RNA sequence: GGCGGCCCCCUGGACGAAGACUGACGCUCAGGUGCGAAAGCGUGGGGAGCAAACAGGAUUAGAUACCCUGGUAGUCCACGCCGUAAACGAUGUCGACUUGGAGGUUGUGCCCUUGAGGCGUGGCUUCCGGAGCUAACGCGUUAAGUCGACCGCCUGGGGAG
RNA sequence: GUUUAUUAAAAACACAGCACUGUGCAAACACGAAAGUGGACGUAUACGGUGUGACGCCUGCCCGGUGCCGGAAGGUUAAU
């Protein structure tokens, strides 16, 4: 139903959960799934087996856009940094390249304190 | 900080960027810095190293 | 007060410490060229502007347009202005005439006045925003195209020139920035000329404003006669609001012609 | 080595994490050096020593 | 008369323009008396970052013996002309009369 | 103290040197002169991101709380009364001190510069060496062992800042 | 002070700064049926609300109620 080729995959790898996000080769949303919302929202959501089926039920919805091959977006990681890729390119999705732009973020916009956790 | 795979069975080669970039920028930054007290500790540990 | 010359008040030695001190811009005759404004309110018959006590206005400068673009000029003297506090100056311009000029802070050497499309980017007369650079000082803006002086005084309202801004449509201004009018208004630069009449609490009275008029006093306060309040006993305490029309946030306006305003943050 | 023409065939000192290798390795004199380092200074800054490997 | 080592990035395509221009910009040196070293058309080029959109520039180095009266002039003339995508001046440490 | 990119101007201090010119015009200071980390006074504001107060949801033996989103002030300061506390050889002024020897650095004299610096040698800094001095840790000559010009502080509890 | 000549003769208080406030301008007000004259020969540091209580500090706090209004996620249920 779109035909696209490409895709887009901005993995949310995440500190607190799992949202692997799917966009097309211009840059508007083309499909996605998570971790927390699938059935696990609480301190359980981001961990190594929800975080590949985040990914492999993202594809399950992906697959009827027409997208075969993607590039990989880091600009959030976590745990954990490559099993959200292995999950698509396992599910058929080819990874043709990771851009790791992940910004730290750098220390003069100095990122929430919290409790001194 | 940009790297292919090819034939992408999956390759795994994308494992170099541990250099520095990807994996080294943690130092300072995690959630929050460290804020005070992190200047003369970069040198202090220059001496646990000696060995 | 803190830019020089500040001229300060006197010691405690008398009751008048302020107002302005300063030396060296009251001169006379009143030149050639002038007016004044006229009698008391008189508007026909039963007056709506309260207070009144209206006596000596009393002159003001005639020169508004001020259109003499390209032809130079120099600078004899700065005066006052007391109906707007101003840095007014008198402006030779070398065809053959004076003129009364809204000048900045020290525009005097007698300098190189001199404006217009293309010629000069220097202190200016009336110059065309179209034509020019960017910058935080403007002045004039000639209040829609045509018309004349937005601001006929150097009072400290920088309305501040942006680059490239949704075609010509610049200032970055007071109360809505996004006031969205052409390049082709003109400036002069700019917009401070006498911080010192304004910066500071000129009197308790002082001249301005009891040798030939009286300014507001009251509303509220006093006989019931007027204003929605109060019984009398010194008591008043109800609900009592500005009837029919509203004070301390509403909103007046729905529709007008221009109307531009297109954002207004508020606060 | 203190200009241009030297240090376009210099890039050998270039770590594979984009930066410049501390001299452990071969064993230069200070002077070479510390000229070679500002010679490296203005290529960087006018993109002649095009520094890592997407800039 | 400093050796001010400057770079200035002008659009990309403008290959007519251009020829002209370093002499629209030379016109500043030479009223300076000031003199060139080296003056380098370093072609239409890519960029390290997206400045300007069309992802390369047109290019020019030169290396003048010039006084400080020009170059804040320059950096002026640079910065108020629309197709200057970004410049940049360097200075002393002797004169660069070697192309790049 | 205290700045992190580079530059134009006023161009601090310096301080590596062929020397020239005058011969103690010197050192070191109290009252004062400037400077002045925390903070109040500002007077008008420049009004990101974070986070005291602000504002609650929440963990409730009371939280008057720490979270976590939201939150200013601190960011800094034109300009100026600023004393001031943790800026300790628990310590100024210093010249003579010539067993020293070892590094860390900077500039530099001399070499078929076949050279990783060889022979040198001040400065900036640290290492840590006898005779002595001496508790116990060891400090071991520029260091407390000699010799000294003062502008000093030093009047015991508790009375006090 | 000579202020409400007329109860008090001030033991009224007219000051004057200001946070907010009315209007991006045929600007607020409209006396007059048609003015566009005040404000203007003028811009939101001109001019008007509601006041201010030397001067300089100082304005903690506390939103239950009721003001002030401003809004739009959605229900009461009118011209249309």
Redesign the interface.
């Known amino acids: 139903r779109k035909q696209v080729s490409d895709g887009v995959a901005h993995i949310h790898a995440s500190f607190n959960n799992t949202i692997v996000t799917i966009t097309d080769r211009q840059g508007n949303a083309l499909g996605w799934a998570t971790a927390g919302g699938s059935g696990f929202r609480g301190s359980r959501k981001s961990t190594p087996f929800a975080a590949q089926v985040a990914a492999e039920r993202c594809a399950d919805a992906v697959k009827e856009y027409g997208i075969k ?1 993607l590039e990989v977006m880091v600009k959030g990681p976590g745990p954990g940094r ?1 099993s959200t ?2 999950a698509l ?2 599910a058929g999705f ?9 910004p ?4 003069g916009c ?5 409790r001194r ?1 | ?5 090819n034939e ?1 069975f ?1 390759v ?1 080669l ?1 494992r ?2 541990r ?4 994996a080294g ?2 130092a ?2 995690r ?3 460290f ?1 005070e007290k992190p200047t003369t500790e970069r040198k202090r540990a220059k001496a646990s190293a000696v060995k | 007060v803190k830019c020089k010359p500040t001229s300060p008040g006197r010691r405690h030695v008398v009751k008048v410490v302020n107002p302005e001190l300063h030396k060296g811009k009251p001169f006379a005759p009143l030149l050639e060229k002038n007016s004044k404004s006229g009698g008391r309110n008189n508007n026909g018959r039963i007056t709506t502007r309260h207070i009144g006590g209206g006596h000596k206005q009393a002159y003001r400068i005639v020169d508004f347009k001020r259109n003499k673009d390209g032809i130079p000029a120099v600078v004899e003297r700065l005066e006052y202005d007391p109906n707007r506090s101003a840095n007014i100056a008198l402006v030779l311009y070398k065809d053959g005439e004076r003129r009364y000029i809204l000048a900045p802070k020290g525009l005097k050497a007698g300098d190189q006045i001199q404006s217009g499309v293309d010629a000069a980017i220097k202190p200016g007369n009336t110059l065309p925003m179209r034509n020019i650079p960017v910058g935080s000082t403007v002045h004039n803006v000639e209040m829609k195209p045509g018309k004349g002086g937005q601001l006929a005084r150097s009072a400290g309202t920088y309305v501040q020139i942006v680059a490239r801004d949704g075609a010509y449509v610049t200032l970055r201004l007071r109360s809505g920035e996004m006031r969205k009018v052409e390049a082709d208004c003109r400036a002069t630069l700019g917009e401070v000329g006498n911080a010192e009449h304004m910066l500071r609490v000129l009197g308790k009275a002082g001249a301005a404003r009891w040798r030939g008029v009286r300014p507001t006093v009251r509303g509220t306060a006093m006989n019931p006669v007027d204003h929605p309040h109060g019984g009398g006993e010194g008591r008043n305490f109800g609900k009592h609001p500005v009837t029919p029309w509203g004070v301390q946030t509403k909103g007046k306006k729905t529709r007008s012609n221009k109307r531009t305003d297109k954002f207004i943050v508020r606060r | 080595e203190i200009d241009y023409k030297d240090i376009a065939t210099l890039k050998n000192y270039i ?5 410049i290798v501390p001299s452990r390795i071969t064993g230069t004199r200070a002077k070479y050096q510390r000229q070679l380092a500002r010679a490296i200074k203005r290529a960087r800054y006018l993109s002649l020593l095009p520094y890592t ?2 800039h | 008369m400093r050796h001010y080592e400057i770079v200035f990035m002008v659009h990309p395509d403008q290959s007519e323009q251009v020829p002209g221009m370093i002499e629209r910009y030379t016109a500043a040196i030479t009223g300076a008396e000031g003199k060139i070293h080296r003056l380098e058309d370093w072609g239409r080029r890519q960029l390290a970052y997206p400045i300007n959109k069309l992802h390369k520039a047109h290019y020019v180095l030169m290396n003048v013996e010039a006084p400080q009266e020009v170059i804040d002039e320059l950096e002026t003339t640079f910065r108020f002309n629309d197709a200057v995508i970004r410049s940049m001046v360097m200075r002393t440490k002797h004169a660069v009369t070697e192309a790049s």
Request: positive net charge; hydrophobic residues 25%; contains cysteine.
């Open positions: 091959n490559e890729i292995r390119n396992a080819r990874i043709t390249n990771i851009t790791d732009v992940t730290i973020p750098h220390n100095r990122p929430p304190k919290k956790v | 900080i940009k790297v292919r795979e992408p999956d795994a994308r170099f960027k250099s520095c970039e990807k920028v943690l300072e930054v959630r929050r810095e804020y | 770590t594979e994490s984009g930066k490997d997407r």
